[PDB]
């Protein structure tokens, strides 16, 4: 193949250009996203029961649905919570690789069979089934700076005018409204109701009858009478459209003939569907949209498209309406693209510089400058071919592939310059000879590097999903690099390089280069002199090699492992938790103080605070809240002290004084769709029918024990909420029957007034919306209000609720949890400093085994994956070792010589471990992939040394020492050229601070450390490997030259 | 409430005896009540923390504190079967005939859940067996409604 | 696929302007378009124009005074004039529908409205003319 | 049955339409509601969309709005069909 | 139409470029492909 294209340099250029064309086309068409799919696919069922308590939600909705969630393919586990806001979410999580559209469809079909069993009020709210493991592309907030709109007004505008256009925009796949369209709110007055002998029952009946849309037939309808001349629709009652029309609904006509209108017993207003959440952006009322990326969409395209769509709506906004963008992953993605291109552009410059320093002509310099971009461009086409996207991981895969691509270019070009100079051969003929020396090894290298990088792609779960991105990127780039090194670079060597006079090593040049050439000739002589002396007493260095191997194992065992570096993503969260029974108003003061702090003591760093009163990440409730802090651009935040990690610690410290609440700030995870990754995720499970109180006791027992091993476990805590006071009201069935009060009128009066009730629909400015009846707030606040509500008996007398009811305080749950269908309590935690989360997990199970009979446990989330993917790393890499060995055995036609390559593996690893240990980094996935590329390069260097040495013995007859010394002399320069260019090319990654620097630091420092020791150590050690392995496995004469 | 009041309430609910004792020593109000009027004694009677009940009473806790609906720690202990706590409360002067806003007595509550031994203790301490809640019902009425024949006997 | 010749335009109510205002805007655009016959030709609505309909108001006060329930009223009007699917029956082994509707001659013209009686709570038969009024208006036979 | 256009649209069409989001590869949606009591909502998907998937996703969104529709509309049966294929043949049946 | 008018020139720029490249490999020349590609209008004028 190289010979064919040396004689057809334009055919070679044509293949290169078609490759570049295919790659450029892929770049204009591939999806771009921050991350590929990494979280296991999850489907969430959401339902709402207005006015329902947690236990009511769970026992009428959650359990009914859960009992039908079987016979679903590839389900890993199921979890749910049912809470005091009337909300249930059931999350089913599927194995990695499950088609999420199939999983959703199967969940939906099982759900739809339980639907007729759910209370009608839950069915009427709509039970949604959504893919919930994807994360937000962006969060749009909406405010009115004129101050003229409540959050309900803003939400209605967003629901009616903005939400669907957004949903219709190119690349959007889901959209969540922060609030609701308007509902018609009827706020009942129990004094006025009683005055007219009425109840919420009669109000609800009158609305259904007088807010109706009646199908009435036609004049002249079919089948018609003969001779009919008129056909026309009959129009009877139509939905009401205004508060005025609702107010004149006729409840009753009194004895004197006077009229009781709905507005005589209720206030009537457009309002929200519910009022649990107060949303504020920098302390002003707000609504908003949470926007998700559609599967396989381009995230950059969608964000731009969303922003254009909102720009085109902006003229038709009511005065003051303002769009804000507190969250958007697009900017961070652009920094990643720009930092990766920057790294590529400057790695090409550095290769130019090193190529010129050593080969001293601009023609040789052009060839790597051409071949590397051809392979990178072409690599995108291979990614397009396999369905992958441009994301953070594939892009860092390519910067990691620079070392291998640069090496292919340097190895080809440096070897032709050496053959030319050592032999005076002309370009065309020196390239033919030089390619003959390296071509077989380049193909064996491609196989060997496949066996290094491909087994990665077979890790399970979330980690395998990440590795798969690196594995496919690096292997595709590597394969393409070899193709280009057998096709384009030989043809470019033969037609662009100019001859070198035999024996000329530039030692007679003037100026700096002549000094360099005389210094580097001297250095090579010292080097081969040194290797010669080392080869005289190989045993001493075999002892030194063992010292290195034991030191690597020692360093490896002590380097903490982790998942992905934290990043300053420009956004963080601050949690607000108030005591039991604390009210919305009390939580709002704390959020106001939190908001004030960020916009005051962090003015330079903070752009906005999006505060949500009514939910947290422990749960929902009036005593819970979250503030999402959006920071100014990283550019305007120079300094260690102005990064998320530092702002977060200052805030938490400042909030330690807040006495009404627990207030904590913290960073986002690197992959917010996956969360934590730090620690374990334990589920305590009621497996007899022990009930909630016994489960809490067992949970408290386990928590107490855990706090008594603080050397092993730390911060082991419940994820959910504690029991809170509730008001238990007993209806006396006997007294109700005696008075002639029906229980349906009783429970409907209590529920509609105190919880509210969805009656039916109305039409507001052309759009269908809900009607809700509820008591006006002042008659539904405290236990004494109970007695102001009257129900009408069969005999027509009004009976106060106090006549047939009693009440008491008790404790119960604001949020019930279930795991795989059984009552459960989730416990978070983490291994103590310097301890393994794998061993912390072992202690947890031993403590758990002491709990009362009927209590059991299970692991979920990141901990579930661990217990199903720890046996993988040694066996997957046993496989890699064996295949590398086999590939090497074919390349060299020997069972023993592969050992002289494989023994270089610890030489790069010890420098990587050293660089990560010194810098206090972890064994994370970026470190791991860098390890394999360092091992890759180091193995490639040894393969060519050993190939040159073995060929010198085989086809030139040289004895062992002369062949080894001569191979090592020939390979010194290209090994140093690649290593100097790559080490320099990766330096910006090691010292990077700012946007994305957590990832760059991680790929940079293990690679730079590994590259240093690999090169310095391998150029002395693989000659030793080759000599001792050749001497140990042999028979007849091979120390001496032969014919 | 105020500072050390809140920590004592949560201490009594969680059953943390040493910490209850420590908060006592630091001058915490034994009779600190939350929003619904529960004292530490309410909390410890509800959750069944016998030792905390003793420690609170030894330190002068109102044995007859009532919540905002009129219920006392004896109601809670009698309702949820904590016999030893019912005896400790009565020994320390708990009003055996206290009525909540519904006219409900510890005897009604103990009877409604069938705690036969508690019912005998309360009777021994002078529980009015004919006491009536707001609906005219006695512990006997409760017994026969529940079909509890043993209880029905004891309550004449 | 259909047509392929020409264009296919959608005029859209994006405030809550309502159907009458949308027709006006549509008529405006159609008039302008007919004033560039060198550019556009045969630009026309795809759908239907508003037609007379019979608007019948039930007086809630008179119904309540007579003791006639609104459900009996709307069900009598709807079932007689529009017809109603009641339940299923079996015809030669196969399940099919039952429909109740007025015979045609009692549901043709506005004067037929008053021949329909609803029974009050006190058992008296009340004609529809006692608690209803009606007028002609215009509305859409087909909303898009 | 017996419904006028506005009744059809405001009790059936809008209720279903408001649930027609979160569907993959949708290009646009159109509907008409008429004096015969009939509504047709047509969702049109990008070329190359698997029509069996598109139908299944539409059906699943529809089935969530079903409990909100008048009982008389539910009893008639709400169909969800692939409507872009054309007639192979039309058979007529007469009695001579 | 409003999503597929920009296609015909760019899709056929692509076709032109690849034809050129294929011709350049066939003839081992960057210039000789032009003596083939220039025949394209000769059939088009008769079709038009
Ligand atoms: C987290 N989430 C999306 C937010 C954020 C801020 C908010 O201000 C709100 C939500 C949830 C939305 C859901 C909507 C829902 N719907 C889309 C109208 C809804 O039916 C309910 C419900 N559970 O009844 C709401 O709470 C809701 O009305 C609501 O009040 C919300 C709300 O106030």
Task: Say whether the D–C interface has 3 or more Cβ pairs within 8 Å.
Answer: yes
| N residues, chain C | 144
User: Tokens representing A284?
Assistant: 């002003």
Distance CA(A357)–CA(B132), nearest Å, equals 105
Chain C contacts of D75, Cβ < 8 Å? Answer: 85
* Beta-carbon-side half-sphere exposure of residue A937 (alpha carbons within 13 Å): 37
Which residue in chain C has the smallest CA separation from D8? C143
User: Tokens representing A189?
Assistant: 């007055």
A111-133: buried (b, 16+ CB within 10 Å) or exposed (e) per residue? bbebbeebbebbbbbebbbbbbb
User: Smallest Cα–Cα separation from A175: which of D87, D66, D20, C105?
Assistant: D20
Per DSSP, A457 falls in state: G
State the smallest CA–CA distance between residue A143 and chain B in angstroms. Answer: 36
Q: If 0-12 CB within 10 Å is exposed, 13-18 middle and 19+ buried, where does residue A293 land?
A: buried
Distance CA(A644)–CA(A942), nearest Å, equals 44
Number of H helices, E strands in chain D: 4, 2
| C-alpha D23, offset from chain centre | 15
3-state secondary structure A842-857: HHHHHHHCCCCCCEEE
Q: What is the dihedral of CA A671, A672, A677, A682, to 10 degrees?
A: -150
Distance CA(A520)–CA(A949), nearest Å, equals 22
* Beta-carbon-side half-sphere exposure of residue A854 (alpha carbons within 13 Å): 12
- Is the CB of residue D70 less than 8 Å from the CB of residue D21? no
- Is the CB of residue D44 less than 8 Å from the CB of residue D29? yes
**3-class SS of residue A731:** strand
User: Tokens representing A346?
Assistant: 């400057």
Distance CA(A671)–CA(C79), nearest Å, equals 60
* Beta-carbon-side half-sphere exposure of residue A329 (alpha carbons within 13 Å): 25
DSSP secondary structure of chain C: ----SS--------SS--HHHHHHHHHHHHHHHTT-TTT--S---SS---EEEEEEEE-HHHHHHHT--HHHHHHHHHHHHT-EEEEEEEETTEEEEEEE---GGGSSSGGGGGG-EEE-TTS-EEEGGGTEEEEEEEE-SEE-
- Is the CB of residue A928 less than 8 Å from the CB of residue A955? no
Distance CA(A68)–CA(A109), nearest Å, equals 10
Which residues have C-beta within 8 Å of that of residue A1018, sequence separation ≥ 6? Answer: A904, A907, A908, A938, A941, A942, A975
Per DSSP, A923 falls in state: B
Distance CA(A23)–CA(A104), nearest Å, equals 35
Q: What are phi and psi of A765, to 5 degrees?
A: 50, 50
Residue with tokens 């986002």: A668
| CATH classification at residue B89 | 1.25.40.20
Distance CA(A748)–CA(A200), nearest Å, equals 7
- Is the CB of residue B41 less than 8 Å from the CB of residue B56? yes
Q: Say if A167 is an interface residue toward chain D (CB within 8 Å).
A: yes
Residue A223: asked if its preceding bond is cis (omega within 30°), the reply is yes
Distance CA(A486)–CA(A83), nearest Å, equals 65
The neighbour count for residue C4, using CB atoms within 10 Å, is 5
Q: If 0-12 CB within 10 Å is exposed, 13-18 middle and 19+ buried, where does residue A473 land?
A: buried
- Is the CB of residue A219 less than 8 Å from the CB of residue A230? yes
Q: Say if D56 is an interface residue toward chain A (CB within 8 Å).
A: yes
Distance CA(A853)–CA(A857), nearest Å, equals 12
- Is the CB of residue A406 less than 8 Å from the CB of residue A347? yes
| C-alpha D15, offset from chain centre | 12
User: Tokens representing B39?
Assistant: 């004292």
Q: Say if A210 is an interface residue toward chain C (CB within 8 Å).
A: yes
| N residues, chain B | 156
Per DSSP, D47 falls in state: T
Distance CA(A1035)–CA(A698), nearest Å, equals 72
Which residue in chain A has the smallest CA separation from B100? A808
Element (H or E) spanning A600, and its range?
helix A584-601
User: Smallest Cα–Cα separation from A441: which of A932, A949, A1026, A1012?
Assistant: A949
Q: In which domain, by residue range, is B76 found?
A: 5-156
User: Tokens representing A220?
Assistant: 């002249």
Breaks in chain D (C to N over 2.5 Å), named by the residue before each, are: none
User: Tokens representing A945?
Assistant: 């040394």
Rounded to 5°, the CA angle C80-C86-C92 comes to 120
DSSP secondary structure of C14-32: -SS--HHHHHHHHHHHHHH
Which residues have C-beta within 8 Å of that of residue A841, sequence separation ≥ 6? Answer: A680, A859, A863, A866, A867
Distance CA(A546)–CA(B55), nearest Å, equals 67
Nominal resolution in Å? 2.2
Whole-number Å distance, alpha carbon A616 to ligand 1 midpoint, is: 14
**3-class SS of residue A53:** coil
Chain A contacts of C105, Cβ < 8 Å? Answer: 225
User: Tokens representing A279?
Assistant: 């949303």
Q: What are phi and psi of C38, to 5 degrees?
A: -80, -15
C64-99: buried (b, 16+ CB within 10 Å) or exposed (e) per residue? bebebbbeebbebbbbbbbbbbeeeeeeeeeeeeee
- Which mutation among A51, A177, A624, A770 tests ligand 1's pocket best, with the greatest number of atoms within 8 A of CB? A177
Distance CA(B140)–CA(B133), nearest Å, equals 12
User: Smallest Cα–Cα separation from A624: which of A994, A276, A1022, A1000?
Assistant: A276
Distance CA(A155)–CA(A655), nearest Å, equals 31
Alpha-carbon dihedral sign for residues A315, A318, A324, A325 = negative
**3-class SS of residue A249:** coil
C134: β partners: C56
Q: If 0-12 CB within 10 Å is exposed, 13-18 middle and 19+ buried, where does residue A227 land?
A: exposed
Q: Say if A14 is an interface residue toward chain E (CB within 8 Å).
A: yes
State the smallest CA–CA distance between residue A442 and chain E in angstroms. Answer: 25
Q: What is the dihedral of CA A771, A774, A775, A776, to 10 degrees?
A: -50
Taking CB atoms and an 8 Å cut-off, how many pairs form between chains C and D?
Answer: 42
Number of domains making up chain B: 1
Q: If 0-12 CB within 10 Å is exposed, 13-18 middle and 19+ buried, where does residue B27 land?
A: exposed
Task: Decide whether any atom of ligand 1 lies within 6 Å of the A613 Cβ.
Answer: no
- Is the CB of residue C82 less than 8 Å from the CB of residue A263? no
**3-class SS of residue A928:** helix
State the smallest CA–CA distance between residue E42 and chain A in angstroms. Answer: 27
Whole-number Å distance, alpha carbon A181 to ligand 1 midpoint, is: 10
In chain B, what is the greatest distance between 2 CA atoms, to the nearest angstrom?
A: 50
- Is the CB of residue A269 less than 8 Å from the CB of residue A187? yes
Chain A contacts of D68, Cβ < 8 Å? Answer: 124, 126, 761
Distance CA(A907)–CA(A914), nearest Å, equals 11
Distance CA(A666)–CA(B128), nearest Å, equals 59
Whole-number Å distance, alpha carbon A47 to ligand 1 midpoint, is: 12
**3-class SS of residue D15:** helix
Q: How far are the Cα atoms of A137, A170, A334 from residue A331, in angstroms, in the given order? A: 11, 18, 5
Element (H or E) spanning A1043, and its range?
none
Portion 41-100 of B in contact with A at CB < 8 A:
46, 67-69, 71, 100
Chain A contacts of D78, Cβ < 8 Å? Answer: none
Whether residue D35 and residue A233 make contact (CB cut-off 8 A), yes or no, is yes
Alpha-carbon dihedral sign for residues A30, A36, A42, A45 = negative
Q: How far are the Cα atoms of A70, A1032, C10, D64 from residue A47, in angstroms, in the given order? A: 19, 73, 36, 11
Residue with tokens 């008179």: C62
């Amino acid at each position: 193949m190289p010979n064919f294209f040396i004689d057809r340099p334009i055919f070679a250029w044509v293949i290169a250009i078609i490759i570049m064309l295919a790659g450029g086309l892929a770049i204009l068409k591939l999806p771009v996203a921050q991350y590929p799919t990494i979280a296991p696919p999850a489907v969430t069922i959401s339902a709402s029961y207005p006015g329902a308590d947690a236990k009511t939600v769970q026992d009428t909705v959650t359990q009914v649905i859960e009992q039908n969630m079987n016979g679903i393919d590839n389900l890993m586990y199921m979890s749910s919570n049912s809470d005091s806001t009337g909300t249930v979410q059931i999350t089913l999580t599927f194995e990695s690789g499950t088609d999420a559209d199939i999983a959703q469809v199967q969940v939906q079909n099982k759900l739809q069979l339980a639907m007729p069993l759910l209370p009608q009020e839950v069915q009427q709210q709509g039970v949604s089934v959504e893919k919930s493991s994807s994360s937000f592309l962006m969060v749009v907030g909406v405010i009115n700076t004129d101050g003229t709109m409540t959050q309900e007004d803003i939400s209605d505008y967003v629901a009616a005018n903005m939400k669907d256009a957004i949903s219709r925009t190119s690349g959007v796949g889901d959209v969540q409204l922060f609030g609701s369209q308007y509902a018609m709110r009827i706020w009942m007055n129990p004094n006025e109701l009683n005055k007219f002998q009425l109840t919420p029952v009669d109000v609800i009946t009158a609305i259904k009858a007088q807010n109706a849309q009646v199908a009435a037939g036609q004049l002249g309808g079919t089948p018609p009478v003969k001779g009919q001349q008129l056909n026309a629709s009959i129009i009877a009652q139509t939905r009401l459209t205004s508060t005025e029309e609702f107010g004149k609904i006729l409840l009753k006509v009194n004895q004197d003939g006077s009229r009781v209108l709905l507005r005589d017993v209720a206030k009537i207003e457009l309002g929200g569907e519910n009022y649990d959440i107060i949303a504020e952006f920098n302390g002003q009322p707000a609504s908003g949209l949470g926007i998700k990326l559609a599967t396989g969409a381009n995230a950059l395209d969608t964000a731009a498209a969303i922003r254009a769509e909102l720009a085109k709506m902006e003229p038709f906004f009511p005065s003051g309406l303002k769009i804000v963008y507190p969250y958007d992953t697009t900017p961070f993605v652009k920094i990643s693209i720009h930092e990766v291109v920057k790294t590529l552009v400057e790695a090409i410059i550095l290769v130019f510089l090193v190529m010129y320093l050593f080969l001293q002509n601009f023609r040789a310099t052009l060839i790597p400058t051409i071949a590397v971009p051809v392979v990178l461009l072409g690599t995108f086409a291979v990614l397009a071919a396999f369905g992958f996207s441009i994301n953070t991981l594939t892009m860092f895969g390519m910067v990691l592939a620079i070392g291998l691509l640069v090496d292919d270019a340097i190895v080809v070009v440096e070897n032709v310059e050496r053959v030319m100079a050592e032999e005076g051969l002309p370009p065309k003929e020196a390239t033919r000879k030089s390619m003959g020396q390296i071509q077989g090894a380049l193909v064996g290298i491609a196989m060997v590097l496949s066996a290094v990088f491909v087994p990665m792609a077979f890790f399970g779960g979330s980690t395998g999903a990440i590795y798969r991105q690196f594995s496919i990127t690096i292997v595709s780039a590597m394969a393409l690099s070899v193709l280009v090194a057998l096709i384009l670079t030989p043809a470019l060597c033969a037609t662009m390089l100019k001859p070198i006079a035999k024996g000329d090593h530039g030692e007679g040049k003037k100026g700096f280069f002549g000094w360099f050439n005389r210094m580097f000739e001297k250095s090579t002589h010292h080097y081969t002199d040194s290797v010669g002396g080392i080869l005289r007493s190989t045993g001493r260095y075999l002892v030194l090699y063992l010292i290195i191997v034991v030191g690597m194992a020692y360093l490896f065992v002590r380097l903490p492992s982790s998942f992905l570096p934290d990043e300053d993503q420009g956004v963080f969260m601050t949690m607000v938790q108030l005591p039991a029974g604390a009210t919305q108003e009390r939580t709002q003061k704390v959020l106001n103080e939190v908001t004030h702090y960020y916009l005051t003591k962090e003015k330079n760093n903070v752009e906005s605070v999006f505060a949500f009163n009514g939910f947290g990440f422990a749960g929902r409730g009036q005593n819970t809240g979250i503030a999402f802090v959006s920071l100014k651009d990283w550019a305007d935040r120079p300094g260690e002290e102005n990064k998320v990690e530092a702002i977060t610690m200052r805030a938490t410290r400042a909030f330690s004084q807040i006495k009404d609440a627990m207030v904590f700030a913290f960073n986002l995870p690197a992959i917010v769709e996956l969360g934590t990754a730090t620690g374990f995720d334990f589920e305590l499970i009621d497996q007899a029918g022990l009930g909630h109180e016994k489960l809490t006791q067992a949970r408290n027992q386990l928590l107490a024990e855990a706090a008594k091993h603080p050397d092993m476990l730390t911060s082991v805590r419940p994820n959910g909420l504690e029991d809170t006071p509730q008001f238990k009201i007993d209806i006396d069935q006997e007294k109700a029957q005696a008075l002639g009060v029906s229980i349906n009128d009783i429970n409907t009066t209590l529920g509609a007034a105190w919880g509210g009730s969805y009656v039916n629909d109305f039409i507001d400015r052309g759009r269908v919306k809900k009607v809700y009846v509820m008591s006006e707030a002042k008659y539904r606040m405290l236990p004494d209000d109970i007695g102001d509500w009257y129900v009408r008996a069969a005999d027509g007398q009004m009976v106060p609720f106090s006549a047939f009811s009693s009440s008491r305080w008790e404790y119960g749950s604001p949020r019930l949890e279930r795991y795989n269908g059984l009552p459960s309590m989730e416990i978070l935690g983490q291994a103590a400093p310097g301890k393994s989360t794998g061993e912390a997990m072992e202690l947890m199970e031993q403590l758990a085994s002491k709990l009362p009979t009927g209590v059991g446990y299970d692991w979920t989330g990141m901990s579930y994956q661990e217990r199903l993917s720890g046996n993988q790393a040694p066996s997957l890499y046993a496989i890699s070792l064996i295949v590398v060995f086999l590939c090497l055995a074919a390349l060299y036609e020997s069972w023993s010589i592969p050992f002289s390559v494989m023994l270089v593996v610890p030489l790069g690893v010890i420098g990587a471990l050293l660089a990560a240990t010194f810098r206090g980094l972890t064994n994370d996935v970026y470190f791991q992939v860098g390890l394999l590329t360092t091992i890759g390069l180091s193995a490639k260097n040894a393969i060519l040394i050993v190939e040159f040495a073995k060929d010198l013995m085989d086809k030139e007859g040289k004895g062992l020492i002369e062949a080894t010394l001569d191979a090592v002399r020939m390979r010194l320069r290209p090994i140093l050229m690649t290593s100097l260019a790559f080490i320099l090319g990766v330096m910006p990654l090691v010292i990077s601070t700012g946007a994305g620097s957590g990832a760059q630091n991680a790929v940079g420092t293990g690679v730079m450390g590994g590259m240093v020791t690999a090169t310095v150590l391998a150029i002395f050690f693989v000659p030793v490997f080759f000599v001792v392995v050749r001497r140990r496995f042999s028979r007849k004469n091979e120390d001496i030259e032969h014919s | 409430g105020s500072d050390l009041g809140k920590k004592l309430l949560e201490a009594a609910r969680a059953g943390r005896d040493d910490e209850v004792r420590i908060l006592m020593a630091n001058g915490a109000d034994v009779n600190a009540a939350d929003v619904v009027g529960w004292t530490p004694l309410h909390l410890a009677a509800y959750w069944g923390h016998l030792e905390i009940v003793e420690v609170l009473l030894k330190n002068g806790a109102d044995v007859n504190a009532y919540d905002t609906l009129g219920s006392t720690p004896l109601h809670l202990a009698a309702h949820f079967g904590h016999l030893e706590i019912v005896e400790v409360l009565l020994k320390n002067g708990a009003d055996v005939n206290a009525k909540d806003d519904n006219g409900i007595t510890p005897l009604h509550l103990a009877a409604n859940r069938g705690h036969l031994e508690i019912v005998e203790v309360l009777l021994k301490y002078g529980a009015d067996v004919n006491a009536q809640d707001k609906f005219g019902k006695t512990a006997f009425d409760i017994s026969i409604n529940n079909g509890n024949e043993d209880l029905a006997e004891i309550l004449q």
